[PDB]
């Protein structure tokens, strides 16, 4: 896997915020979540809330029956990453108590000035086999790719900030494993 | 082990501090302690005080009979992590002179601007065996999980700051060991 279009983040001239008098624009930087999973079924999510009284907007699937406990841990908030444009990043994480049949990897770097650091190469393979040499097994002859790549924020001329995302490439080798149902 | 609900730290809109005119909120960041232990008995604590004249509040278990020596090292301040909501983080550390039956790992990053960096993955196993291939042995048929994950501070609109914490997942493999006496 790698992030596609990293160089696009060098566009420091498109109505940005001059870092100083006659400065180039402030480049995309700051709070970032890079995450990607390979699964024989949907990624399984646990809900965790920064603020349990946050009202998640109509049209997103969010933790229901939020209690103050939702802010630290509340096992009611289970869900399947089964729909796009659906599950907000900020209230769902891979559920570590499940996902036997998925391999997930992610990193949160927080901070308004965190520099993006995106490596690209076609030479880096990651193995999906577990301690017992078994990879994810594709139930229903389906493979489930999940990903988030919030790269940082774009700072507009006014100072107003927009999250900026990038596509993720996947290439998965698969083989056939005999199974008793 | 991993921290549960890392993405919740991207909630930069909940009455935070605008980093600048039309800025998003300043994200959770700054002084962090991520720590976790697996033990056959309570984690054993040594007291160390930033300021020995600090009066730790009624309802917490703190170093008693504090002297100026308490500020660097004072072997009076021993204790067992045997109670929740009890032992303040800032005046207790694992006692390195005695946790034979525990495996502890922690990191302090200090600084108001330290960016959170939280990795998640279901692929990373940590082995608990010592130099002699023996893991912690569970006295009383009890396993002791200890943890701290102060992620940073939330900066409110006023600038006022609150520590923000997150739950920690544990999954411990155990086996049976023959023992004399």
């Amino acid at each position: 896997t790698e992030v596609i279009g990293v160089t696009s983040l060098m566009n420091v001239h498109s109505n940005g915020q001059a870092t100083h008098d006659n400065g180039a624009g402030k480049p995309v930087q700051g709070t970032s979540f890079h995450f990607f999973s390979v699964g024989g079924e949907a990624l399984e999510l646990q809900g965790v809330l920064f603020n349990y009284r946050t009202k998640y907007p109509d049209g997103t699937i969010f933790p229901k029956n939020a209690t103050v406990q939702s802010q630290v841990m509340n096992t009611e908030h289970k869900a399947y990453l089964d729909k796009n444009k659906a599950y907000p990043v900020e209230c769902w994480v891979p559920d570590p108590t499940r996902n036997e049949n998925t391999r997930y990897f992610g990193t949160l770097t927080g901070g308004e000035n965190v520099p993006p650091v995106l490596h690209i190469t076609n030479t880096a393979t990651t193995v999906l086999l577990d301690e017992f040499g078994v990879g994810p097994l594709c139930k229903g002859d389906n493979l489930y790719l999940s990903a988030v790549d919030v790269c940082g924020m774009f700072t507009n001329r006014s100072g107003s900030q927009q999250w900026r995302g990038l596509s993720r490439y996947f290439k998965v080798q698969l083989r056939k494993r005999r199974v008793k149902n | 082990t991993e921290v549960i609900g890392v993405t919740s730290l991207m909630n930069v809109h909940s009455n935070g501090q605008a980093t600048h005119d039309n800025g998003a909120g300043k994200p959770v960041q700054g002084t962090s302690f991520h720590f976790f232990s697996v033990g056959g008995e309570a984690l054993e604590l040594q007291g160390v005080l930033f300021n020995y004249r600090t009066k730790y509040p009624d309802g917490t278990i703190f170093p008693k009979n504090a002297t100026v020596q308490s500020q660097v090292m004072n072997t009076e301040h021993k204790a067992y992590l045997d109670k929740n909501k009890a032992y303040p983080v800032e005046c207790w550390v694992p006692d390195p002179t005695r946790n034979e039956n525990t495996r502890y790992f922690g990191t302090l990053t200090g600084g108001e601007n330290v960016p959170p960096v939280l990795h998640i993955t279901n692929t990373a196993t940590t082995v608990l065996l010592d130099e002699f291939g023996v893991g912690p042995l569970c006295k009383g048929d009890n396993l002791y999980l200890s943890a701290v994950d102060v992620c940073g501070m939330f900066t409110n609109r006023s600038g006022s700051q609150q520590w923000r914490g997150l739950s920690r997942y544990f999954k411990v493999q155990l086996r049976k060991r023959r023992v004399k006496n």
Partner: antibody, heavy 118, light 110 residues
Framework: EVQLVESGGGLVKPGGSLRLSCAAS????????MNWVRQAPGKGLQWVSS????????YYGDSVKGRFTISRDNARNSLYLQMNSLRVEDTAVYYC???????????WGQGTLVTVSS | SVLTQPPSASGTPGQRVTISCSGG????????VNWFQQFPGTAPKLLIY???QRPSGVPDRFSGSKSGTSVSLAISGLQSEDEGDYHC???????????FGGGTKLTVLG
């Protein structure tokens, strides 16, 4: 630098019709969402209608839903407002205004007067 | 759904005057406020954009502040040339349209 010029305003009788014209020079007109805003004599401003660069998204104020139609011709560098079923209340100066990203509504035309009277 | 600004305001030359604009989560909460200056019998012109920013041509004197669902415009070093109507504007996500305020006629007492 950037100029917008309205035209087509005049006197028409209630139940009447009228087509307004905005002429854009000074910028790639075809790149920007464009707006109509009107100002009844002595009163403040009131937004009429928006149209996207490619005319994919038109929006109207409740005030004229179903009666007015916004349109643009990107080949003719012109924004239009088709005003049907005109009422006495619709009397105002009709300003033409550009929306740019992050800037919001920035440049206005000189306005053109629409008087709806017997 | 409505932007509320004072129908009138005034000050003495050299003073700082403050015109407020109050909205709700559907408009000013989630969308930026531009201020437009209007002299009688001319068009509105951009004075402040994105709550707090000046286009080229607008003196240092003119400034803004945003606090959640309310914004203010701050005219410092008041002059007679500042006599006119000040309009507040912001997109409303519920009405899918632009909402304006009433307008504020600023009188200068000299």
């Amino acid at each position: 630098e950037v100029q917008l010029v309205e035209s087509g305003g005049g006197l028409v009788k209630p139940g009447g019709s009228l087509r307004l014209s905005c002429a854009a020079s000074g910028f790639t007109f075809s790149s920007y969402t464009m707006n109509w805003v009107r100002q009844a004599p002595g009163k403040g401003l009131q937004w009429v209608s928006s149209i996207s660069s490619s005319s994919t998204y038109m929006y109207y104020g409740d005030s004229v839903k179903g009666r007015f139609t916004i349109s643009r011709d990107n080949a003719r560098n012109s924004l239009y407002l088709q005003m049907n079923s005109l009422r006495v209340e619709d009397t105002a100066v009709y300003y033409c205004a550009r929306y740019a990203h992050d800037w919001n509504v920035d440049y206005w035309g000189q306005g053109t007067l629409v008087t709806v009277s017997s | 759904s409505v932007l509320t600004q004072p129908p009138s305001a005034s000050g003495t030359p050299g003073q700082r005057v403050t015109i407020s604009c109050s909205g709700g989560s559907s408009n000013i909460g989630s969308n930026p406020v531009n201020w437009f200056q209007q002299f009688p019998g001319t068009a509105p012109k951009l004075l402040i954009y994105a709550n707090t920013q000046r286009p080229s041509g607008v003196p240092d004197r003119f400034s803004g502040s945003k606090s959640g669902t309310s914004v203010s415009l701050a005219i410092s070093g008041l002059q007679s040339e500042d006599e006119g109507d000040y309009h507040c504007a912001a997109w409303d996500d519920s009405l899918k349209g632009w909402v304006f305020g009433g307008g504020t006629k600023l009188t200068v007492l000299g």
